[PDB]
């Protein structure tokens, strides 16, 4: 159960800092 | 009391680490 929950969240998280580190860049 | 000051931690990092990638890109 909480299991897909961090996984979602984490996906989530990454492709935010991911898109933050290219629109700084 | 511990567990913000990672958040907070992991925050800051996360944000240099991103300003450094895309500062050197």
Do not use: E
Not at 3 to 17: K, Q
């Amino acid at each position: 159960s909480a299991r897909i929950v961090a996984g979602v969240w984490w996906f989530f998280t990454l492709i935010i800092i991911s898109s933050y580190t290219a629109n700084l860049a």
